[PDB]
Structures are given as structure tokens and as C-alpha cells.
UniProtKB/Swiss-Prot annotation:
Induction: Highly up-regulated during growth on PET film.
Outcome when changing W131H: Displays increased enzymatic activity on PET bottle and on BHET. Exhibits improved PET and PEF degradation capacity relative to wild-type PETase
Function: Involved in the degradation and assimilation of the plastic poly(ethylene terephthalate) (PET), which allows I.sakaiensis to use PET as its major energy and carbon source for growth. Likely acts synergistically with MHETase to depolymerize PET. Catalyzes the hydrolysis of PET to produce mono(2-hydroxyethyl) terephthalate (MHET) as the major product. Also depolymerizes another semiaromatic polyester, poly(ethylene-2,5-furandicarboxylate) (PEF), which is an emerging, bioderived PET replacement with improved gas barrier properties.
Record-given protein name: Poly(ethylene terephthalate) hydrolase
Reactions accelerated catalytically: (ethylene terephthalate)(n) + H2O = (ethylene terephthalate)(n-1) + 4-[(2-hydroxyethoxy)carbonyl]benzoate + H(+); (2,5-ethylene furandicarboxylate)(n) + 2 H2O = (2,5-ethylene furandicarboxylate)(n-1) + 2,5-dicarboxyfuran + ethylene glycol + 2 H(+); an acetyl ester + H2O = an aliphatic alcohol + acetate + H(+); a butanoate ester + H2O = an aliphatic alcohol + butanoate + H(+)
Length: 262
């Protein structure tokens, strides 16, 4: 009997819909600490404490690029903070520092009786996600913070592609026709480098660099996979082992790989 298991037994239909079972509320972080701005999404009556996910956009980009993840994840039983960085020109290591700052603030707000997320977060169970340089930032966060329970960056880029130290279960969303952070020189070498973890590579067929962003046309598949990965690894929830680890066998996917996916 897994104490972190929340919500109804998952179905494809329920994981593919635009929102899951829980009602989602949100607020703006009034005094953001160590980053630009943040929006916190959270479920009402998830049936216990839930893990937290900090999501960072890429270079020149804002919360809007990665907004859709907030309600999508939160509606399956997660507290999600989407951030703006101190500057939109921040680099990946700075993105990562700011991501971890956002998580610490979430942990702090869990114990502030005035916060709507008071007593709602299990602050020992956290994950990281993000687009482009924010994707590299998530991988950096993971490498520097092995206590994190999961990472799921999208169209990631960093100077280095060597993330061989990462022990955090890591799902890489890739975009097949990415001409900004091309798969062959960023997402794929990143993926291949990680020898110490459960991991997955999911390339979206014909996707541009923004193929996992708000307003994308594979929200059913991408949302299912992100929630399934976070469920399986953040909650240790083996109801999601198949959703998390399976090949989707979808014409929407041009390349699928996975390793150590129990």
C-alpha cells in the first residue's frame, strides 16, 4: 500500500484528456525569492500531500511557453510552479539555480499558514521540467540535486551534452525537426550520455523547437507521458509503470527509446 498514490486508477482516456480528475487553482507568488516571477498551480483535495514540480522556459521566453503543464500536471495531483527567470537571457546554470530557488520557495510556502498550498506539499518529493535552455537547466538541476525524484525537460540544450552523472529518472521530450537545438547535437547525445538512470527519449514527428509548448498539437500524448513519468517516479506509483515505460506506437512519434524502465 503505497502512501504516495493519489487519485483514480489511470486510463489512456483520462491521461489523454486536457485535464485530469482534480480541480486546479492557482496564485501568483507575491515576493518571488531567487527568480523573476512564479505561478503556483495546485489540486484541491488530492487525498494527501503531493510532490512539487518547477518548470522553467528557455532563452527569450516566458511562463506562457510552458504554462499548459501547470494545470495539466496539477489536475493529476502535483503542486506546479511555472517561473519567469530574473532575465530572459539567463543561461542554463542560472536557470537551474532559479529552478531550485522556486522549489525552495514552494517548500517554504508549504509551511506558511497564509499560503493556499499550506500543508499540501510533500517537500521531499520534487521534480524538474523545462524548455530549451530551461531543459538544460532541469538536467543541471538533476545532476546537482540527486534527491530530486524526476526530470522531464523538453527540446533541451546546454553547452555540454554530457549528463552521465544523472541518477534522476529522466524523460527527454525531443522535437524531430528542431533547428534551434537539433536533436542529433543536443537531445539525443544528452539522452545517450545518461548511463546511471531510468530514462526515456520521445521524439515528436515533424516537431519544431516548440513542439512541447503551450498550444502544441500533441497535448494528449505529451501530457499523458509527462504525467505518467511524474506519477511513476515522483509517487513510486506502479499503476503508471506501463504508461510511463511503454512505446506509444504512435505515428506522432518518430523515435522512441527507453532504458531501466521499471
Amino acid at each position: 500500500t503505497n502512501p504516495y498514490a493519489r487519485g483514480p486508477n489511470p486510463t489512456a482516456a483520462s491521461l489523454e484528456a486536457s485535464a485530469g480528475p482534480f480541480t486546479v487553482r492557482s496564485f501568483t507568488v507575491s515576493r518571488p525569492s531567487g527568480y523573476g516571477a512564479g505561478t503556483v498551480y495546485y489540486p484541491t483535495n488530492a487525498g494527501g500531500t503531493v510532490g512539487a514540480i518547477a518548470i522553467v522556459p528557455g532563452y527569450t521566453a516566458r511562463q506562457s511557453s510552458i504554462k499548459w503543464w501547470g494545470p495539466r500536471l496539477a489536475s493529476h495531483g502535483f503542486v506546479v510552479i511555472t517561473i519567469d527567470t530574473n532575465s530572459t537571457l539567463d543561461q542554463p546554470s542560472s536557470r537551474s539555480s532559479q529552478q531550485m530557488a522556486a522549489l525552495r520557495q514552494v517548500a517554504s510556502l508549504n509551511g506558511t499558514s497564509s499560503s493556499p498550498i499550506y500543508g499540501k506539499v510533500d517537500t521531499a518529493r520534487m521534480g524538474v521540467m523545462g524548455w530549451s535552455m530551461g531543459g538544460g537547466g532541469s538536467l543541471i538541476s538533476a545532476a546537482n540535486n540527486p534527491s530530486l525524484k524526476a526530470a522531464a525537460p523538453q527540446a533541451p540544450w546546454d553547452s555540454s551534452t554530457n549528463f552521465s552523472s544523472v541518477t534522476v529518472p529522466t524523460l527527454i521530450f525531443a522535437c524531430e525537426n528542431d533547428s534551434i537545438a537539433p536533436v542529433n547535437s543536443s537531445a539525443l547525445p544528452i539522452y545517450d550520455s545518461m548511463s546511471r538512470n531510468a530514462k526515456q527519449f520521445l521524439e515528436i514527428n515533424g516537431g519544431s523547437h516548440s513542439c512541447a509548448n503551450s498550444g502544441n498539437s500533441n497535448q494528449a500524448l505529451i501530457g499523458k507521458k509527462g504525467v505518467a513519468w511524474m506519477k511513476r517516479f515522483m509517487d513510486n506509483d506502479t499503476r503508471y509503470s506501463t504508461f510511463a515505460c511503454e512505446n506509444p506506437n504512435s505515428t506522432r512519434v518518430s523515435d522512441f527509446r527507453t532504458a531501466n524502465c521499471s
